[model samples]
Each structure stands twice: as C-alpha cells, then as structure tokens.
Target: ATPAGSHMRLSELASYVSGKLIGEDKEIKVGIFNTLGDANPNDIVIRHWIDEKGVEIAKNKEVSALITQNPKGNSLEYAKKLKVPIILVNKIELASAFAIKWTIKNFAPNTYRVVITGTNGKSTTTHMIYHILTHAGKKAFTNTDAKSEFNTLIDPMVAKLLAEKAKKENLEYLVIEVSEVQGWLDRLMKDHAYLMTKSINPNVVVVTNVALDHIGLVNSIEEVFEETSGAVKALEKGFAVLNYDNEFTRKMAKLTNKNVKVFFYGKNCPVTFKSGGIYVNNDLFIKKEELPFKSEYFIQNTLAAISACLCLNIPPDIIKKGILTYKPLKRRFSILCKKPLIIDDFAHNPDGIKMAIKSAKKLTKNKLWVVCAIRGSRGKIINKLNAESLSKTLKNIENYEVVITNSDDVVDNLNKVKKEEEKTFLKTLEKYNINYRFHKKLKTALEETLTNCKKDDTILLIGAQGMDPASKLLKKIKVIPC
Candidate 1:
C-alpha cells in the first residue's frame, strides 16, 4: 500500500513506535529521514534540537515531516495536524538510529573497506604499503593522518566516494585507518582485509605491539589483543606479523594458527636470516651494516612493513626496495619550520611520545625543545594521567625543555565533577613536577612557544594525530615565512 508521500513504512520504524501511545499511520512510500542538520526538499528531517534558522528553511522547503521530543513547545504541532507525522520517542539517539537505518536500506553498498589496525605505527606503516601499491602503477586509495585524505563516512563522504570510484577505476588497494571499532565489532565488511599493525591475535592474525591509546575502551591489554584475535579467527587464511622486541607482540605471535606464518622484525632482528625472521644489530641498522643512520623504532616500523609484504608473498627485492624508497609521511617527524630544525610529529599516545622523544634525542645534536599537547579523547582527567605519565617519562631529558598544553579536549562531563577528583589530578601533576600550562587553547600556546624559540634549538612539536589544526594555525600566524 503506498500510504502517503510523507510516510515511511520500514519494519524498523514500525518496531520503534509500536505500542507506545496511540498513533495513526497512513501508507508510507517515499519518506526520507536524516539528522537535524541534513535536510533537502521533500525529505523528512528529524531535528531533536531546536534551531530558529532551520525551522524557517523547513517552512520554505518541501520538508514533509519534523520529528522532535519536545516539538519546540508545540510550535511545530501545525505540521502534525496537517498530517506531517511528528514522532515523539523516549530517546532521540535511538530514534535517529532507527530512522537513519530505514533511510540507508534503500542505498547500495558502494565502498570496499581495507581496515588497518594495531598499536605503535599503524598510520605510517599502512600509508607506506599503500604508497608502494600506488607507485607500482596500481590504482590505490588510502586514509590516514598524513594527507587530508578522503574518508567515506566523514570529510565530505569522499572516502566512500573514492571507494565507489575504485570499483570503476578497478583499484588494487584501499588502505584505511581501521580503529578498534572494527576489532570490537568482530566483523569486517565483504572483501575487507584487516591488517594488524601492533598486537592483534597471532594465531590467525598479525600482531603489532600493544601500545597504550584507547585503554579505557577495552578491559585490559590482553582483552584488546583478544578482540584482535577475533578478527584473525574470522579470516580465511591469516598471518601474524610481529615485532620481536615488544614482549606483548611476541606473546601474540604464539597465538597464531600452525598454518599462519610468523614474520618477526625488530632492533634485534637479523639482517641475513637462515630462518624467517627480520634481524637487527646493536647499531640498530637493517640489512646493510655500514649505514650510519640508526633508530630502533624506525627500524621496528620498517621491519613490520617488510614482514607484511613478505607474508603477502611480495618478492624480497621489491620488499627491500619498498622500505628504502618509501618516504616518511608528513608530521611523522618531518623537519618543517627549520633554522634550529623545528620538527612536527603526530605522536599522541604514551608509546608514541616515548618514541618521539627517543628519536628526537637520537637525531638532533642541538638542545631539544619539545612542544607537546594532548588531543581528542585523552583530554579527560584520567586520560590526562596518561599524558602526565608521558611528560614524566621525559625526565631523562637533561638538554630538553618540555612544554605541555591542551591539544585536544577529553569527552566527559566536567561541569559535574567532584572536587576531590579534580584535586587528585592536580596533586599528581605537581608530584611529577611536569612543566605544563592550561591555556585551553592550543594555538595560543603554540604561538607563545614559537615566539620564544630560537633557531639554534631543535623545536619538536608533537600530538594531534594528523592535520593537528595546530599545524595550519602555525602557517596562518606567519611563523613559517614565505
């Protein structure tokens, strides 16, 4: 039955409003629903929140329905009276989810997802492989912190659009930042391959090192590893690429299937191996011993990539060439605003912080001035503890000047916090003697630091996963002269 033009007859919608106060429903046919801000002519937009300007636009447009909990004090009741269905639900988020579910059912799946997850260096490692595939003359697409890359779900839905283009272009690879969301969900979309960057399940998976990032989301480090194991178990034929130096990654390797090959790489990994393992010497060099450049973390990240390439059955020469030819992505410790060599890196996690500090110390001969700030989910008080720990870890920096500020906001209700909890964090920061400032604005803090910094001192800017906004702000402020 083609109900009315404004009605939606999806089973999910029917399930949601059933048995909840009496409501009349005419036959639904071409009803469409989207979030509050997303509205088009003839589409039903559910804005749970009130907006004066949006209301005026709805009036002018052919919007058939407006669903809200309060109905803006019955201001929009005229629509319901005119047979424009107005739904009142107990929860707005749930109602939106149901409505969105219905709207999406008519759309076809257009994107092929290749999820990359792990700890430590997933961004760099995934992008490198993606670059290799693209460089080898394959039509490949990628998503990471390096480029303002297209992501399907966000950033103008370009990532998804790119995936659609891939089908037409016959793309060979679609490398993306597969967060813990995929691991926790326990399902990969069709034809999607999961690349384990750190400590994923070893038995049927890849194990990158288990670093500290989203600690609060998972139960423990082991549980995080287990979640990744679920991904490995689901794979038809999985392989575990492990970092041997990391005890956790090594443990993950033991969990892989007998059929799954173990490709190990690290600082202690061997150059020329009779057995199948990457070898590194005390000098922290890979393959060639005479190379003067030495960085254990860089070598470890490189070895992880090399191991993945080998497991995928790429030739050794190509794998080696990929490692050597691949250039580090922007903000992965690139010296941008140089004079005293101001370096930028997206190292937000504790493990990342440690690596950045270690790398800066190894590469720079001048006094190191570390300008770091916390971003995103870690802005909460508890997460601040992790940030504080990172600051504390930099205690060995005798020639380093450390400055910390708020780079990202933590997601929490700070307006309703107990005084004692706040005090405890202050006490911890004081006890650790971590030099920090609470500017609440990253740009202001960055500008203040940059003005005071000298060209002779190596400036190390860390934090903000990618496009740190701070980077753009720096350019805006004319810190980098044309």
Candidate 2:
C-alpha cells in the first residue's frame, strides 16, 4: 500500500539481500515517497514500482535514494544494474510500518500515544482527554475524524519541523487519536507508549464499550471483547482501564494476567473504590455522590481519561480539574445550530446509533428528527442486520421521525443487494412505519427530509464520520430562516 506520505528515511533499512541495502543501513537519514506530484527540497524520494513508469520517475527525479521491493525487476534491476543506491524491504507492508516509525522518531521525538478504538465513544473520549490536558496548562496534540491536527502543534508529515518549533516554543504532551487501521497495520512504533482509548493489544489499554461493528473484520462480539482484553494482556506491564457499566468493558477484568494493572470507571464502581476508581455520583471534581457531568456517556469518557491520567501519575487534583473542565471534540454530539437543535454525531453502527438516539431523546423535549445513512463498504449481512436492528430501536418512537438514506460509495444498483436482504430491510422499515428514503445522492435525501421538519423539531444527523459535501450544502441553506 502506497501511504499518502513517503517520509521514510534511507539509513534505517536492515540489510542488503541482493547487491544493495534491503534492510540494514545506519547512514541514510532522509527519504521521501511522494504520492502527490512534487517533493519539497531536502526530501529523499522513495519509489516502489518496478515498471517502465517507475524507471522513468527514478531516473528523471532528483532524489537522494530509491526504495523498491523487487531489486531483480526491470525498474529496480535497471537502477541496481546502473549502480544506483536502492533500499529494499522484506515486504511492502513492513516497509510502510518502518517508514511510520522513522517519521515518528524524526518528527515527534518526545511523543506520547493515545490509542482510541471501539465500536463507539472512542472519538469523544480521546478528545476529552486532549481538552483536559490542554486546559490544565499543558501543551497537547491530537488527531481524529480521518484527519490529524495538533491543537497548537503541527501535522504528522512535517513532524520534525513541528518538533523544532515546539522546542523553541516550549510545548509538551502529545495525544493521538489513532485509528484501528493504523494499529492493525502495525504502523505505530514499538517504543512509543500508547494510551488505549478502547483498543486492543496496546501498552496501556482502555475499553470504552465493546459494540457490534467491524464484525466482518473482527468476526464476533466475543472476539471484539477478546481483542480489547488481548490488548490489555499484551501491554508488556501495561494497564487495563475499563468502564464498569458496560458488560463488555467489565468482562476485560477477567482476561488480564496478574501483571496487568486493572482499573474501573463507571456508575457501578464499588463505594470502597478510591481516587482512581472513576466512580460516579461525583461533583464537578470527583466529589462524593454528586454527578457533575452532563451526559452519562461523557461521564464514563471523562472517568476513563482521568484513569489514564492517573496511570501517568498526574496529581489527583490536576486530573480532577482537567476532567471537570474538559470539553468534547466537535461533531461528537455537537449542537451545531441550537435554535432548531441540529445535533451531529459520528455513529455508524447499530449500537452507536442506539446511544445517539437515546441521548437525543434524553436531551430534548421536542420532536426528534433522526437522519441516518449507512456505510457502503459494509457487507450485505452487516447492512441488513444493522437495518433490522435500527428498526427495532426506533419501534417505540412516538415523537421522533426517522429517515434512512443511502451512504457514500454504496453500490447504487438495487440489483446489487441480494433479493432476501432487500426484502428484509424493506419489511423491517415498513413494519415500523419509519419514514425512509433511498436517494443515490445524500443532498437530495437530506433536503427532502428537511422540508418535512417543523419549527420545534430537533434534527439529528448520524452516520458518516467525514465532512460530507451534502451536509455542507444544507448547512449553507436558509431553511430555518434567521
């Protein structure tokens, strides 16, 4: 896989397999693999293809070193035959992992990792952690929502440059919202200490809540819990922080070995549980029996963050102060326009949708208008199962209007879905009288639903994590006349 950025260096490969450096080297310090067209000066370019085009780029480009998988092939063989310096890797995936490691070493030298992985709540939880740390007068950084922005920091690609800047400016504390794809790919460096948000196999792992999503990839619900617990076990003397309220999170307590430190956060923590217990009935600052947090879910998230901070030996007062003043990241239950109560959340799966809907029901008294869209990449079983599950959740809705719309990159042709699956989805929606519409375009679907909304309606847009062009279109519209 050609990563979006090619900032791998030339000196870090292991040893030469053929006539060149395949893995071993300690001299080359810079390399660049430009997926985009132009390379900035001082960037060492890396090209992996062994085709004619690859040859041309390698020869024509003014790069310090060329990296390729196939040293015997045409493009690479030509380079090798011509005595050009080529660094090879055991596998493309391995090369990518190595490149990210090198980038981290060069860019984020004083790095701290916070890995948030779960079916839901990870984004909100991780962001809260960043907010708390920053509010406590600590310079912090984080990445999320398919984008990484260091709040007062710099981008990952220009990490070294940013590091230099941070040093001059005197900044510290890095909070990363790492994706499962990055973790699964083993992209994160081994040396970097990871704060598990809800992910598995981390150095210090946390479980937000295990839900039924990415089942196609991970297999089963038990496997999901196992993965999270496995992460706790694999921490190499790491800590496992769990949410007590969630049955799945609680299950992690039994999975860890004696070496892994276990901590709990939730309403169900024992009265005997102490400072780092993360029990509820809390005041604004973890007081006894006074809930100061707004949302129950947010309470759990804050508690989790507090536990993580405590693990780092951050003072109890500072941790409490940090949590009580923490604010969640944008688009995670953010009320973008409160007049009509336009709520947005990144809930794609059934469990997440249930939580978001439940939250909406609790927070508003007006009629709730739920606009949901499904992911196209999800398999047929998942789509049908989620549709049926969502229908069940919306069955008791008396004051809520549900609108189901098609998602991006979805195979539009109805012929693509199996006859039985389509029948199940249609029957479920019809049985529940859920006002659903399937438009090939998201904008039209949202627009049609918006026309049906009234003045007292609370519009909640759920599903689809990234910023959509259609949502941007509606945000610009004067539907609710100012």
Candidate 3:
C-alpha cells in the first residue's frame, strides 16, 4: 500500500516512524521533512542535536514537529517551551532513512535505475550511462553534485522532487552516483542496516575498481572493498557489473545474491572491450575510436558503461552512437591547450594519480611537469599515499618536474590544507629524493610550470577539489605555439 500522503498527520508520522511522542496528540499536518536549517512552518525537522542557537532557529521557523533521539537535552526543553511536538526515536538517522524510504516507495516513479559506486571514475561512468540512455531517445535523470536538484537519495525532499520530475517528464531511466562515504555504509553495520529502509534499489549495479581511498574511515584495502561492496549486496536481484581488472571488484561478483547476474568488463576480460575499438567476445560492437577521450583509464570506464548497457538490453547501435559523441567531463583529464600541452584532472588518491600520470606520459615525450595541489584535510595517510604515487610514477621519467601547492585558499572550508598533511607529503617527496618546488597557492605553481614549459612539454594540473580553479587560470593564460 502507498504510504501516507504528503500531508501526514502527527499521529500518522508517529505510527509510521514507530517513535514515542512527547507532545499533545493533536491533529497537526506536515507536508515536508527537512533538516533543521531548511525547516519551514509546516515541515517536520530531523535533528541530531539541539543547542541554544538551534532552539532559536526552531522557534523562529515554527516547525510543525521535531524528530530527535536526544529527548532530554536542552533543545528538548526549548521544544517543550515552544509547545512543538517531539517524536523521540532511538536512532535519529535510521528514523530519517525510514521516512525517506517510505516516501520514495509511495511516490517515486517505476523507472529503470542504475547505481555506480567506486573509488574513482564514478562521475564519469555515471555520466556515460546517462548519456547512452538519453542518446537512445530514452528519458533519463542523474544526480550530479554540480546540480543539487537532481542529486541522489541523500535528502528525502530531493528524492521526492526527483520522482515528481521523472513522472512529469516520463523518464525511463535514473542514473545514481553512489559514494562509499556518502552515507551509503560506514564501518559498523549500524549504518549498513539503513539500506533496508531505502527504496533506491537499482536494476544494474556498477563497481568501477575499488582502491584505497578514505583511509581515515576504512583504514585498510580490504575494508575499502568491504564497504564498497555493500552497494552490490544491496541489489536483491539484478546485474552486478564488476571490473574484471581489479581483483577486489572481481571478487565482489561472488558476494551478490544467487539470483543476481554477474557481468565483467576490463582490458583483457573475455566479455569486455579494449582500446582500438575491439570487443573481446562480440564483434557486433563498434570498432572505431568511439569516445572523444583517450587513455586506458577511460577505456576501462567505457567498457564498464557498455557492459551495463548490454545488461539493460540497450541496442548495441544506440550504445555506439552515444559513446562516439560523448565527451569527457571537466577535470577528468580535460585538455586545456595544444602547444606545450596542458591537462587538468581530479586525481587525488594514489591509484588515480598513478593512472593520470601514466596517461599523460603517453601524450608527449619532451618533458612532463605536474603541478599538484595536495589534498587538504584528508590526513597524513592519504597525503603520504598521494606523494608516494606521484613519486613512483615519475621515478622512471627523465628530468620530470613536480610542483606541490596548498591550493592558495581556493578550496572550500572542509578541504582547507592542514599543516600535518602538508608536512607529511613534503617528507614523502624528500624521502624519494624527488626534487620539487613548494608553493602556497595553486596559481603560482601553475604560473611557474607554464613559465618553465617548452614546446611539446605536457603540464598536468593535478589534485582533487583544491585544483578546480587551475582550469580557469589555464584558460586565461596565453598559450605558446610550438
């Protein structure tokens, strides 16, 4: 049966959430459930903690009800004083997940959904699948970070709105980018249990090669595999798209339900495609340089995308057309200049940096210069890994130049460079006897690299969120002809 309507009464909400109520059992109606900061008069607000400031905001917003775990806190007292109904639950996050799942189950459109999860190439692969579907004249929607309105099921309201939009547009597919750290599943199985409360069941699940990322959270390579594999496990019965090249992802195929179908994609996988437009098992697939981008990394991502489309029964002709016309997303090895070639990429982790550098090596032989913005605030472990990856990749290259920067305060608050991370990264460079120049700003490092580069030289703007501004700066600089 469909869940309660948007205008859910306080009594019905309590019953649905199975929480104890602490306020008068009055017939109050709520049309929305939102975070504390986004709450409105008719919305139910879910909060983990309540402080004096929170009390003021809650009273000013005049929220219809409060769902919280801390019922004895000062915020609860304030709620009582304000005469706001309080629904007390043992776990606020789980309760919120339940609410979102209930709403999605009742409202979201019955569309073919795909969830792509991995350490890297998630955005690229997600975009690839979405493009293929839309290029085939199938209406599709994807939640990209740049556009919050179409974001994934993180927010209950966003999910509801996306469902409404999909129904209105008659969309046939919904592509979702799932990150391991983005509330998908944490260390403890406590958070993992929340998956049961989500209606985001995908028809096809893509695991694009797991690597060591979020070391602070998971700690080990095995844990990374375990955490990421939850997305595949969440699938009741569908296609589990595994990366044939990566052992962890290949192993993940074994963990899926018995009824789930497993498909593999890699450079040499019997069922995968390779560079030179060659398909291993099927000759019916395209044989041209279908993608606008080049690199083994991209080829693997394309193979994964193709494998997923095939599982969905999408015609091979449509897939070929979609791939041929598709361009790589910004910051995923995007080229900025022709002479004295310049490329921008979001290669933060070790494996990503290694792949980016290796790909750049194939582009030119004159000299390769990498101007990297150290990923700030991740911690010493990741910093060390990033430095090691860069060092190892350039060790064999003759006279390669490496420039490290702190991103010059261009990054957001959460990604601000910590002193410890920078120190550890520098130490790693020193340990490898890799000569490097340090700058506090990304602009200066870029300028230095551009100034020193000559004809046929390739300058790489590398790092994660901090290096985003480098692309704009590169565009503004005058390129020197060979």
TM-score of each: 0.62, 0.71, 0.85
lDDT of 3 by residue, 364-415 (tens): 7688898899999878899999999999999988857999999965888888
By summed lDDT, which 10 consecutive residues of candidate 3 come out lowest? 189-198
The lDDT per prediction is: 0.52, 0.55, 0.74
Candidate order by decreasing TM-score:
3, 2, 1
The ten-residue window of minimal lDDT in model 2 covers: 191-200
lDDT of 2: 0.55
Off by over 4 Å in 3: 1-12, 15-18, 26-84, 148-158, 182-198, 278-280, 284-288, 476-482
Sort all candidates by lDDT, best to worst: 3, 2, 1
Using TM-score as the measure, the top candidate is 3
Q: Give a tens-digit lDDT track for model 1, residues 217-299.
A: 54356655665544344334456566677776677666665576666676445432322234533333235442223344555
Q: Deviation in angstroms for 235 in model 1?
A: 2.9
Q: Give model 2's clash tally.
A: 15
User: Which stretch of 10 consecutive residues in model 1 shows the poorest summed lDDT?
Assistant: 195-204
| Candidate 2 lDDT by residue in tens digits, 212-299 | 7664555567766655554454455566777777788788788777787887776645311345334433533465344331344555
